[PDB]
Amino acid sequence: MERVNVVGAGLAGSEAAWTLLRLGVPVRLFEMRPKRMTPAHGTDRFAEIVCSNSLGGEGETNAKGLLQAEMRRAGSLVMEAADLARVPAGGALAVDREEFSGYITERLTGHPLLEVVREEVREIPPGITVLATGPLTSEALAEALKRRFGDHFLAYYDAASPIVLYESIDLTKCFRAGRYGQSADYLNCPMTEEEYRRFHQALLEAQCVPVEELARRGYQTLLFGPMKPVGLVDPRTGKEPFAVVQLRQEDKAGRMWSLVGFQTGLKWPEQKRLIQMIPGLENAEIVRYGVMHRNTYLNAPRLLGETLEFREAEGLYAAGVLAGVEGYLESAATGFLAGLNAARKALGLPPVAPPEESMLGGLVRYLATANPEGFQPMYANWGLVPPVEGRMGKKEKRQAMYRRGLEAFSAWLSGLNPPLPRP
């Protein structure tokens, strides 16, 4: 019909291309490597794994585990490669990285419907196009995306604060409120002077400014910063608290709230330790840890639909880190969806999206509808899907969520018209 462009042959680009091919749609796959390398890549292989060889935990209480199962059910090339290249790593799905990318490279390159172009794409290609250029998207394409969609809707670094599950918050210790300049819908966690003092020092021991760097500059620094109580009034004392930690709603459904101004580079167990010191958050469940690093991505809530098609550019898609996710598997899975919808478009069919119970479904809903102001990248986590009701233990609830999501995803796949062929 029409040959579809896929820009970038990483995790997301490789899966997109494959999905197009599986549906008999011809692909033009651009990859600048090796003509131009990124600071993190060392080969010219498709889907090169640049760091850890882990695709995440595979257990039935792990959100990444559910996403693995969905992609396996979908006949994903990345999962096929991963299962073949698997090496023992207790708990996690880990791979021999060269075998993995070699297998993926061979399968794609040897497909007759696939044409590979070894060039840096400097402008958005016309026609039906999937952009999947990753955290180290070439500067020229990044600037082309800004020119086309707006210079505040692409970032070159993230600065993400920890996000906690709302249902894990002890709300008796908080209050909704804003100060002048703020929306009245922040959650506030008040601290006494002694509570702040101990918090500040634990932060020293834990080691757009990273929050720990502010502590390091002194006791007063945080208080002048993101923990300033000015303009707030505790309705439990009728007074302005000594200090506060504010939380803001991140997802449309309200299951996920971030700590305001808590961008951080602390190790994950240190973040957990620190957050559980905050009144209201003592047994809060962190579902997305804070990070700050070089990372090119689009503001998905301002730009994309749940289908991963650009809302204001028909037949254009983003996948992977560029689309606002984080993680090898998350990149591949959004690659799959974007490739599926791009293929459908080429075939004159309307777009689809997985259900909200599935991890991929929960993930793309979040990309499309999360809080757009200061949007940060998201990885798979249980905050993304509806909870299971009950008084049974956490592990049992999560197992149920896993089973319900994989079942919803499988039914969705089965309903596909046209269907994806068996692997």
Ligand X SMILES: Cc1cc2nc3c(=O)[nH]c(=O)nc-3n(C[C@H](O)[C@H](O)[C@H](O)COP(=O)(O)OP(=O)(O)OC[C@H]3O[C@@H](n4cnc5c(N)ncnc54)[C@H](O)[C@@H]3O)c2cc1C
For ligand X, the closer of residues 280 and 327 by Cβ is: 327
Pick from 21, 85, 159, 321 the residue near ligand X by CB under 6 A: 321
Size of the site for ligand X (CB under 6 A): 34
Pick from 33, 97, 107, 365 the residue near ligand X by CB under 6 A: 33
Query: For the window 41-80, what string marks contact with ligand X as x by the rule CB under 6 A?
Result: x--------xxx----------------------------
Pick from 320, 339, 354, 362 the residue near ligand X by CB under 6 A: 320
Is 177 an interacting residue with respect to ligand X (CB under 6 A)? no
For ligand X, the closer of residues 121 and 370 by Cβ is: 121
For ligand X, the closer of residues 38 and 276 by Cβ is: 38
Is 30 an interacting residue with respect to ligand X (CB under 6 A)? yes
Pick from 328, 382, 409, 412 the residue near ligand X by CB under 6 A: 328
Pick from 6, 11, 308, 384 the residue near ligand X by CB under 6 A: 11
In the complex, minimum distance from the CB of residue 130 to ligand X, in angstroms, rounded to a whole number: 11
Task: Give the Cα separation of 104 and 78 in Å (integer).
Answer: 7
Query: For the window 102-121, what string marks contact with ligand X as x by the rule CB under 6 A?
Result: ------------------xx
For ligand X, the closer of residues 257 and 336 by Cβ is: 336
Which residues are paired to 94 by β-bridges? 54, 87
Are 61 and 402 contacting, i.e. CB atoms less than 8 angstroms apart? yes
Three-state secondary structure string covering the chain: CCCEEEECCCHHHHHHHHHHHHCCCCEEEECCCCCCCCCCCCCCCCCCCCCCCEEEECCCCCHHHHHHHHHHHCCCHHHHHHHHHEECCCCEEEECHHHHHHHHHHHHHCCCCEEEECCCCCCCCCCCEEECCCCCCCHHHHHHHHHHHCCCCEEEEEEECCEEEHHHCCHHHCEECCCCCCCCCCEEEEECHHHHHHHHHHHHHHCCCCHHHHHHCCHHHHHHCCCCCCCCCECCCCECCCEEEEEEECCCCCCEEEECCCCCCCCHHHHHHHHCCCCCCCCCCEEECCEEEEEEEECHHHHECCCCEECCCCCEEECHHHHCECCHHHHHHHHHHHHHHHHHHHCCCCCCCCCCCCHHHHHHHHHHHCCCCCCCCECCCHHHCCCCCCCCCHHHHHHHHHHHHHHHHHHHHHCCCCCCCCC
Is 135 an interacting residue with respect to ligand X (CB under 6 A)? yes
Is 301 an interacting residue with respect to ligand X (CB under 6 A)? no
For ligand X, the closer of residues 6 and 25 by Cβ is: 6
For ligand X, the closer of residues 142 and 266 by Cβ is: 142
Pick from 17, 23, 141, 245 the residue near ligand X by CB under 6 A: 141
**How far is residue 204 from each of residues 212, 218, 221, 286, 291, measured CA to CA in Å?**
7, 9, 12, 21, 17
Are 236 and 175 contacting, i.e. CB atoms less than 8 angstroms apart? yes
Determine if residue 12 is labeled as part of a ligand binding site.
yes
In the complex, minimum distance from the CB of residue 35 to ligand X, in angstroms, rounded to a whole number: 9
Segment interacting with ligand X (CB under 6 A) among 27-35, 274-282, 310-318, 383-391: 27-35
For ligand X, the closer of residues 66 and 215 by Cβ is: 66
For ligand X, the closer of residues 23 and 132 by Cβ is: 132
Pick from 67, 92, 132, 259 the residue near ligand X by CB under 6 A: 132
Q: Which two tokens stand for residue 395?
A: 């592990």
Is 267 an interacting residue with respect to ligand X (CB under 6 A)? no
- Amino acid at site 160: A
**How far is residue 149 from each of residues 5, 254, 295, 371, measured CA to CA in Å?**
19, 28, 18, 18
Pick from 13, 162, 279, 361 the residue near ligand X by CB under 6 A: 13
Is 203 an interacting residue with respect to ligand X (CB under 6 A)? no
For ligand X, the closer of residues 38 and 221 by Cβ is: 38
Is 32 an interacting residue with respect to ligand X (CB under 6 A)? yes
Segment interacting with ligand X (CB under 6 A) among 36-44, 172-180, 362-370, 411-419: 36-44
For ligand X, the closer of residues 138 and 246 by Cβ is: 138
In the complex, minimum distance from the CB of residue 345 to ligand X, in angstroms, rounded to a whole number: 20
Which residues are paired to 7 by β-bridges? 30, 131
328 phi, psi to nearest 5 deg: -65, -45
Is 38 an interacting residue with respect to ligand X (CB under 6 A)? yes
**Binding site for FAD: what residues are annotated?**
8-13
Q: Which residues bind ligand X (CB under 6 A)?
A: 7-13, 30-33, 38, 40-41, 50-52, 120-121, 132-138, 141, 320-322, 326-328, 331
Residues placed in the known binding site: 8-13
